[PDB]
Amino acid sequence: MKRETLNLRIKPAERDLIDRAAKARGKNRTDFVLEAARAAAEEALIEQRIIMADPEAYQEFLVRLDQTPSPNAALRKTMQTPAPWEQ
Amino acid sequence: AMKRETLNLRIKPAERDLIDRAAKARGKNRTDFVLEAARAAAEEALIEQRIIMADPEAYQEFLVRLDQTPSPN
Amino acid sequence: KRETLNLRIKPAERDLIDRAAKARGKNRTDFVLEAARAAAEEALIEQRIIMADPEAYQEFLVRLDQTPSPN
Amino acid sequence: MKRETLNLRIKPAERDLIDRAAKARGKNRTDFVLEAARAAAEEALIEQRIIMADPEAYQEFLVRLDQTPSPNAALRKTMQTPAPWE
Amino acid sequence: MISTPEPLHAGHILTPFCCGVDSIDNWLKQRAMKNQTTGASRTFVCCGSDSNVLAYYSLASSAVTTNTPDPIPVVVLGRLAVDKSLHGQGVARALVRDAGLRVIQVAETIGIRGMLVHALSDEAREFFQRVGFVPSPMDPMMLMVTLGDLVESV
Amino acid sequence: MISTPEPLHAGHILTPFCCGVDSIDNWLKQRAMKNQTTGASRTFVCCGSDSNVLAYYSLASSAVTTNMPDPIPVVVLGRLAVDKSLHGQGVARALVRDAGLRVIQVAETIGIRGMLVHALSDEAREFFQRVGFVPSPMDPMMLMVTLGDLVESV
Ligand SMILES: CC(=O)SCCNC(=O)CCNC(=O)[C@H](O)C(C)(C)COP(=O)(O)OP(=O)(O)OC[C@H]1O[C@@H](n2cnc3c(N)ncnc32)[C@H](O)[C@@H]1OP(=O)(O)O
Ligand SMILES: CC(=O)SCCNC(=O)CCNC(=O)[C@H](O)C(C)(C)COP(=O)(O)OP(=O)(O)OC[C@H]1O[C@@H](n2cnc3c(N)ncnc32)[C@H](O)[C@@H]1OP(=O)(O)O
Ligand SMILES: [Cl-]
């Protein structure tokens, strides 16, 4: 659809191992690689124990943490709306 | 110059952007992030086929027997 | 133009890393730096959140599981 | 038994993160990096679920697997020596 | 009818869970129980009539710091998903509230200063903005609520 | 007196274990119980008077392949170590025998054809050769015993 080509430099032995694994899974080569990359990417992002900030971003972060508490309308609705399981 | 050997992916830009964020977080280039993820998934897929999914019942017996005390003769 | 980290390494230690890098399809430099990065993140989260106060950390874990009651 | 220099191309931000972690552990920079690499290397080697052989090495491996059973003296002594737990 | 969020255990039935994002369905079925036992993250589930998970989210402790100071402890809201059967009915928003109340009740123990979430798509960012998260200065796809805003929001 | 090798569980005391290789001591204390529960590997321990581990080894299922022929199932002998208190007395050799007898009793379930071990140093290679392992054609630091040699050895 709105798809770009990504051309990745790969050793032929590494390509052949992926083709064997895709075959074993009954998957197309592209789906095997993209599903593996998607799963690894969400894991890499979610499980960051240390989140590194550029110095300017870090001080703004600190400013927001210390700021006078002013919870937006959306957050107020989220935290005050009883859950479906509270009855 | 020797040849550069390529694996060609059609990727939705939102999927590419998620990999770039994950690679950044890991201090890896985009290529290495994708190839290392594919290598790890490929080894997993191949060991699971040959040893678990060729016979799931044989695999469970393997696990059971591995814990039992070895008693020669 | 190239920034270096300088290691004195016993050849037997270097040979073990080359075998491990080979097994992973990584170059030697990437294997060592990725291992150091992962260990560094672990060392820093363990200091600030567990080892600053181990007893506070266990209470954190206890309280996290308890059912939230706003009222 | 002698010491070799390894000079590794590193982004300064990556070097500074290692220095912070070494500091936190009361470790020298070199020990923090080498201990992390040693631990990761043993894990990488032991946890290999699929071990890939060069084709010539692979067929020799299969030849040895199929060969007439010929256990060496060391293996015979290992398997026939009763354990300290009797 | 959907149970109160409780910690995931081995008695919970995962196989039928479908939120419409394969990778998030797969993580529950393949990685969640392993994460729960190793203590990498803490996963909370809602169940229906037969101990079947209809919804889940994960929390983990993390810290923010700057380049070249003590890192700032945060709770990271990880994966969050609702069975398609329950979409459009405030369940996900109620899971975010559940997470927010956990963050409040634990915050003082190790000095949590807020809750972060990594938006994995423009859809997720829109959803997270829609229930009260705001973009962080670090990254527009990393959203946040301060502990101050959370406490005052109740 | 040293107990029969049994599967590692949470009741085993790990902290005092010292074999003289830091990384191998650390793995027992930091990673072994997590591995045991996730099923990454199976760890077996000998204990002394007070449920203190005096010795351990791990086994895991693996496969050898080339290039697409069917990979050969093998058992990998992982880390193996003895408390320094017990060195030079046949304990490690007895652990290798214990491993070999496990490999024999499980081999026909999934067609294990041998046992491999990755020598992590020249010292470990010497030790593994000294109890009957031989260099593989794949790697001189990757040693093996065939199931045939094992069965004939008993
Ligand atoms: C990114 C991470 O780390 S977690 C990943 C979470 N995102 C996913 O893609 C998971 C798959 N999807 C799902 O399971 C669900 O559709 C969710 C979690 C996105 C939403 O679940 P629902 O229970 O339908 O949301 P809920 O009914 O509580 O709606 C609350 C608000 O979110 C909005 N919302 C619901 N779905 C979406 C969506 N797909 N995109 C944007 N906003 C949404 C609602 O319109 C509502 O806003 P409003 O009150 O201003 O109208
Ligand atoms: C590579 C891996 O998977 S882990 C690496 C191996 N383990 C380690 O390095 C951990 C630290 N070391 C140890 O725990 C122990 O010293 C071990 C495991 C190497 C050996 O423990 P021990 O119980 O002393 O061995 P044991 O008494 O059973 O001796 C068996 C044989 O090995 C020999 N041996 C013992 N220690 C060593 C050694 N360090 N190097 C070489 N050969 C050795 C013995 O001489 C004997 O052979 P022999 O019949 O010719 O006399
Ligand atoms: Cl090709």
mmCIF file of C-alpha atoms in Angstrom, chain D residues 10-13 16 19 27 29 38 45 47-48 51 55 57 59 65 73-74 78 80 83-86:
data_model
loop_
_atom_site.group_PDB
_atom_site.id
_atom_site.type_symbol
_atom_site.label_atom_id
_atom_site.label_comp_id
_atom_site.label_asym_id
_atom_site.label_seq_id
_atom_site.Cartn_x
_atom_site.Cartn_y
_atom_site.Cartn_z
ATOM 1 C CA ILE D 10 32.670 3.378 20.922
ATOM 2 C CA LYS D 11 30.310 6.415 20.887
ATOM 3 C CA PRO D 12 31.311 8.726 23.805
ATOM 4 C CA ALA D 13 27.727 8.499 25.234
ATOM 5 C CA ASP D 16 30.043 7.436 29.643
ATOM 6 C CA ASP D 19 31.825 4.578 33.387
ATOM 7 C CA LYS D 27 34.763 -1.643 39.602
ATOM 8 C CA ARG D 29 36.248 0.355 33.723
ATOM 9 C CA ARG D 38 32.927 -12.995 29.769
ATOM 10 C CA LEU D 45 27.970 -20.343 23.681
ATOM 11 C CA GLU D 47 22.516 -21.405 25.130
ATOM 12 C CA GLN D 48 23.027 -22.085 21.329
ATOM 13 C CA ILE D 51 24.720 -25.347 16.373
ATOM 14 C CA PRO D 55 29.413 -28.922 5.610
ATOM 15 C CA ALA D 57 32.787 -30.789 9.618
ATOM 16 C CA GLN D 59 29.621 -35.051 7.602
ATOM 17 C CA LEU D 65 27.996 -40.608 15.393
ATOM 18 C CA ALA D 73 39.886 -45.206 28.489
ATOM 19 C CA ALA D 74 39.023 -41.815 30.083
ATOM 20 C CA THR D 78 34.245 -41.840 34.112
ATOM 21 C CA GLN D 80 32.343 -47.116 35.555
ATOM 22 C CA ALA D 83 29.932 -41.708 42.652
ATOM 23 C CA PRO D 84 30.793 -40.365 46.142
ATOM 24 C CA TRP D 85 26.947 -40.472 46.711
ATOM 25 C CA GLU D 86 27.301 -44.268 46.188
#
